[PDB]
Design a binder for this molecule. Structure first.
Ligand code: HEM
Ligand SMILES: Cc1cccc(Cl)c1
Length: 431
């Protein structure tokens, strides 16, 4: 049978993500009662909900079977779950397809492979170590402002959002003065279905509002990054913006400007917001588990284990979709050619078959098997930079904190996609 209506809506509708408790309960009910079923929500394509850790890996490691962008028919699958009216808007705007960015999530092999190889080396851990000092200096300046601002704040908008964005913008070689513009467009981009993040230039109540907001935000990013691409092509620098802007194909021709824009959009949004969310979720967890803060201050070598458990628990990238290019049997279910799948990375990270007491914050999981960065050739290119940023920040921050207290109501971004806290009122005790 189809998944029960209210379980399916809890996970498919952005509104279903506004509170973590009933969302994660719907996850768990599927893992325990219907681990691979089809959600048939009004206004949405039918979706296989991939709730199980083993199934996430099985799908992600077979891109010849489970495409992101629809394989040879490029843009016939939207790798980010829009509603039907939204996908219809995009096909109207683009002329019959959904490939609204040339960013990695929209690509299939072998194009995905060729484009990813532009930055693969740049993002490897050994190649990121040359940035560690500059990242640590950014952390220290952010912590200086935290300590100066006093102990009562919103740990998200008044702290956690700034460090990750300044790291990315510094790696682009883009001036600090442009950070507020990038922050605002990031909000427009991940807030397409959040009630407090509606753009002034879109009809908020239209059945395709989210898709119109996604398109409008991309057009604003294109305008900004066109100036950057042209600038770095004309005057190359030792920065990430240059690597992206000057990239050439096997024929010695520039990649089309949209491939640079796609990298720039991905790194200027998902390249910092996910970091911000994990750092804020980590502080929220330290408030609930003061003994963990004590322990990590006593043994700073525990910080990477803290990072890994915060990544598992927060899992701020909730899903990507795939399309079956052929019939495929998994967990006694018959997935048909053309069926879409919704990969639930947060659910995989609470799979009791993999994690003992999966809802418990436990930094002593060694190894911490989390799939917060996904899997397969699309596995997060920025995983090493995310682990480095979070390690460096916590190394510099945690000595300064004796206690975190949540003093007010946490608020999550209302999204089925890239979510996490937008507000965490705290009272900090400093050492
Ligand atoms: C806590 C931080 C982060 C988390 C949890 C996270 C999680 C994810 C996940 C789940 C995906 C999808 C993987 C899949 O399809 O199987 C992804 C993709 C990606 N992430 Fe991250 N990410 C983080 C940080 C970053 C950073 C810092 C950057 C870059 C500076 C980055 C760049 C990307 C890009 C470009 C993609 C698309 C990869 C592809 O489709 O091949 N991410 N991330
Ligand atoms: C999570 C994620 C990764 C890359 C691009 C986007 Cl829009 C979002």
């Amino acid at each position: 049978a189809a998944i029960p209506d209210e379980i399916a809506r809890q996970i498919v509708l952005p509104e279903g993500h506004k509170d973590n408790v009933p969302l994660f309960e719907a996850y768990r009910w599927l893992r325990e009662n219907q681990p691979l079923g089809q959600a048939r929500v009004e206004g949405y394509d039918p979706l296989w909900l991939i709730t199980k850790y083993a199934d996430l890996m099985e799908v992600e490691r077979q891109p010849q079977i489970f495409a992101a962008g629809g394989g040879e028919d490029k843009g016939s699958n939207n790798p980010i779950l829009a509603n039907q009216a939204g996908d219809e808007f995009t096909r109207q705007l683009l002329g019959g397809n959904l490939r609204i960015l040339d960013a990695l999530p929209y690509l299939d092999q072998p194009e995905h492979s060729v484009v990813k190889d532009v930055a693969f080396d740049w993002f490897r851990p050994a190649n990121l170590k040359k940035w560690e000092d500059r990242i640590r200096e950014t952390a220290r300046a952010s912590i200086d402002r935290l300590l100066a601002g006093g102990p009562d704040l919103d740990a998200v908008q008044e702290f956690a959002v700034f460090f990750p964005l300044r790291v990315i913008m510094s790696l682009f070689g883009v001036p600090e003065e442009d950070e507020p513009r990038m922050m605002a467009l990031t909000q427009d981009f991940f807030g397409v279905a959040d009630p407090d993040a509606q753009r002034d230039d879109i009809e908020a109540l239209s059945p395709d509002a989210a898709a119109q907001q996604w398109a409008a935000t991309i057009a604003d990013f294109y305008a900004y990054f066109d100036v950057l691409v042209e600038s770095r092509r004309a005057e190359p620098r030792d920065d990430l913006a240059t690597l992206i802007a000057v990239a050439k194909d096997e024929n010695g021709e520039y990649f089309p400007k949209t491939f640079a824009y796609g990298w720039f959009v991905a790194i200027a949004t998902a390249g910092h917001d996910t970091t911000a969310s994990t750092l804020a979720g980590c502080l929220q967890s330290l408030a609930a588990h003061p003994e963990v803060l004590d322990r990590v201050k006593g043994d700073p070598d525990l910080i990477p284990d803290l990072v890994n458990e915060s990544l598992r628990i927060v899992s701020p990238v909730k899903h990507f979709t795939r399309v079956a290019l052929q019939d495929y049997e998994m967990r006694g279910q018959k997935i048909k050619a053309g069926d879409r799948l919704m990969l639930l990375f947060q659910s995989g990270n609470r799979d009791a078959e993999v994690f003992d007491r999966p809802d418990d914050f436990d930094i002593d999981r060694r190894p911490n098997k989390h799939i917060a960065f996904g899997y397969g050739p699309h596995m997060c290119i920025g995983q090493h930079l995310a682990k480095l940023e979070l390690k460096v920040m916590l190394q510099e921050l945690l000595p300064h904190l004796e206690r975190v207290e949540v003093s007010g109501e946490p608020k999550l971004i209302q999204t089925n996609f890239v979510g996490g806290l937008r507000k965490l009122p705290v009272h900090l005790t400093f050492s």
